[PDB]
């Protein structure tokens with residue numbers, strides 16, 4: 001790629017400030033800045049964070065990004081993100097054998113169908129209680145963040161009161177809501193400090209016998225987390241990874257707020273989801289129309305803009321050379337809405353997921369990563385995430401669960417990260 | 431120390447957000463929050479950035495902080511500061527033998543009296559040209575940042591045009607002006623990226639023969655920078671340390687803006703400085719009244735709030751225990767204005783420096799560090815800094831150099847870091 005931004009002698013400008021000012025529009029801006037259409041699939045080379053980087057898209061980009069023989073993750077994610085959001089020693093930054101042993105112990109807890117089945121009754125119960133709590137007006141983001149958190153903490157077997165679960169869920173949701181914007185970024189570190197302290201004392205309590213934990217519970221498995229040689233990990237690392245199995249479910253509240261606005265904008269799907277639920281006695285769980293609607297929300301609405309990796313060897317993609325040690329960025333939002341692999345890519349239409357047997361197998365559907373869960377860095381919690389979101393979609397599609405319709409409930413900024421309706425989508429139960 | 435902020439079971443709150451909201455008032459706030467007067471010298475224990483920390487003051491605090499047998503600097507400064515401001519591999523983070531060999535090579539360039547004498551004619555010339563440039567109205571911060579930068583680049587022997595010197599000085603001044611506030615913080619990284627690139631290509635040019643450099647010049651000595659075993663350092667490290675010998679002189683523009691406001695607030699000192707200069711034919715250099723005025727500016731006006739170090743062994747100070755591995759913070763602003771070691775500490779009075787032979791020997795005068803330059807981490811550029819500031823004080827004290835008197839020229843916020851008059855002190859030459 002080539003930018004005609006300045007003279008040949010002057011180095012091409014770093015894109016860090018463009019990225020922050022444009023948010024989820026950055027990929028389309030850096031594309032037209034190199035002379036290609038925002039709907040093109042050609043790689044875009046740039047300087048980002050003082051490092052040569054290539055923005056890739058589509059099936060070719062996914063195949064390159066998740067080839068562990070050519071890509072590493074250690075040091076690819078800036079501390080601005082991984083520090084507050086993932087924590088020290090997290091699986092996100094591990095490679096090779098250390099990652100495989102860590103990722104399998106965590107996929108055992110979040111990705112296995114038996115474990116996901118254990119999560120379903122908790123989120124269903126918490127969402128039903130949230131509907132009753134919403135007789136006093138609230139908003140979807142704050143409300144489902146607490147319901148998701150309580151569901152995750154209960155599912156994990158953590159012996160906390162509902163008051164303590166709410167406190168930790170609220171703090172996780174605040175961390176997510178503040179880390180991506182430089183003005184509020186220090187707030188996310190503040191939450192990370194006290195979350196780490198709260199969860200380290202929990203792992204310390206389970207290992208010493210002060211805090212009871214079912215031997216097969218997620219809490220206990222994290223307290224018994226070992227490295228690739230069978231050695232027990234530090235209490236802080238075990239606490240960091242327990243948060244990584246709970247906080248990202250709290251993060252689904254953002255998808256639930258997006259889904260409330262989409263339900264307002266697509267009332268024929270709301271009624272269709274409601275009717276499908278009523279046929280099942282009103283159940284929130286495993287409603288095919290809601291699952292499809294949830295999937296189209298994950299595809300269309302912005303959350304993860306892109307992901308970084310560092311090249312371990314010289315390679316190339318579609319003619320663009322990639323030097324060893326430089327950054328490779330996979331366009332998440334652009335791949336999910338790529339006209340090259342999606343029919344009517346710019347249209348919100350959940351029908352594209354109706355009748356799909358294995359959405360995970362769609363190689364260009366990567367809102368939470370691509371390739372394989374256990375052999376790569378793909379999110380191991382997609383089944384829990386879709387369970388949380390689809391159940392929330394059903395609850396919000398109830399006509400007695402009245403969603404707000406003001407411009408602050410339905411619109412959001414695309415130039416900030418992360419983003420959501422400013423109100424969080426107001427809601428009240430009749 | 432003890433905070434009665436919440437219940438005993440609830441952990442004491444981290445002070446990170448209090449520090450950012452209160453800026454240079456943080457030390458006085460954390461003191462009264464522990465039940466002591468803001469003018470007290472007792473140590474204050476706290477949680478800062480998720481780490482137990484002790485804020486020390488006065489002679490006892492200085493003796494503790496600079497005892498290298500009990501304190502290390504590696505990892506004590508957060509990346510929020512050292513990343514943009516100091517650069518990777520800088521002397522600020524080195525300890526032991528690596529620091530001694532690095533610090534002596536840099537003190538040879540900035541701290542030696544012969545080198546400082548070589549700097550004087552450059553800043554005197556640049557300031558005289560700035561006075562003539564100010565026939566078109568400007569401001570002290572922006573103007574002296576360029577004059578100081580050109581003086582430093584010329585003194586160092588860098589073969590750049592005046593246009594290129596201005597460009598790099600402007601970018602250093604922007605970095606300083608933006609790094610301390612979370613909203614503008616990413617701008618400082620942006621400048622650090624292109625400054626590092628500009629100065630790495632300079633070191634690369636000198637080492638390869640593309641760029642000429644006097645063998646005894648500061649530029650050449652940095653291009654020949656070696657580690658503690660005689661091994662040549664990387665081109666980026668040599669470029670990082672060349673910036674550390676030039677950018678901090680650009681930073682003196684902030685003191686020069688403070689000094690302009692002080693000259694307005696203390697007109698009897700302005701006229702006294704002007705008369706002392708006129709007696710010397712109008713010289714800007716080595717005017718005792720201006721030197722004293724410059725020193726009192728460094729003492730009273732806020733720049734460095736405090737400095738961090740990590741304890742290498744268990745120790746104590748005034749009854750407060752210090753655990754190995756925790757943080758120790760030396761109150762810079764509080765020590766410089768401590769009623770325990772300063773007569774009328776809250777009063778701006780340059781007479782306290784009139785007749786002082788060795789201000790460096792005043793143990794509680796630490797605006798740019800304490801203890802010894804070569805054996806510790808004390809600033810090696812205080813003589814250059816005082817030369818730059820005192821010469822600027824003389825120039826601004828000229829009645830034909832008319833300083834602005836609006837509230838935006840004379841006041842500034844104490845709750846932001848770094849800080850200065852919002853206009854930069856407007857100024858115009860008659």
Ligand code: HEM
Pocket residue numbers: 091092093103106110244245246248249251252255303304307367368369370376377378379380381382384385
């Ligand atoms: C809105 C909800 C979620 C979003 C947007 C999301 C997105 C992502 C993304 C983009 C990645 C990185 C993929 C890669 O590195 O290639 C990731 C990784 C991860 N996710 Fe999720 N995810 C969500 C929900 C969850 C849930 C519910 C869990 C656990 C129950 C979870 C646990 C993890 C873990 C542990 C990783 C690191 C895996 C590794 O590095 O190997 N996430 N997530």
Ligand code: HEM
Pocket residue numbers: 521522523533536540674675676678679681682685733734737797798799800806807808809810811812814815
């Ligand atoms: C307004 C101007 C300045 C201020 C506020 C300032 C302040 C400081 C402070 C507080 C330190 C750390 C002391 C410690 O770690 O104990 C420091 C270190 C340092 N300063 Fe300055 N200084 C200034 C001017 C200069 C100048 C003019 C130079 C060079 C010509 C310079 C070069 C350095 C270097 C290289 C260090 C690191 C030394 C080490 O870590 O051993 N500074 N400065």
Ligand SMILES: CCCCCCCCCCCCCC(=O)O
Pocket residue numbers: 077078081085176247248249251303304305306307308
């Ligand atoms: C240079 C890379 C910039 C883009 C980084 C975006 C990372 C977003 C991760 C979002 C993860 C949500 C789930 C969670 O961990 O709580």
Ligand SMILES: CCCCCCCCCCCCCC(=O)O
Pocket residue numbers: 507508511515606677678679681733734735736737738
């Ligand atoms: C936790 C420590 C917070 C305080 C850190 C303050 C550091 C300020 C350094 C200012 C140096 C100015 C000279 C320069 O390097 O350009």
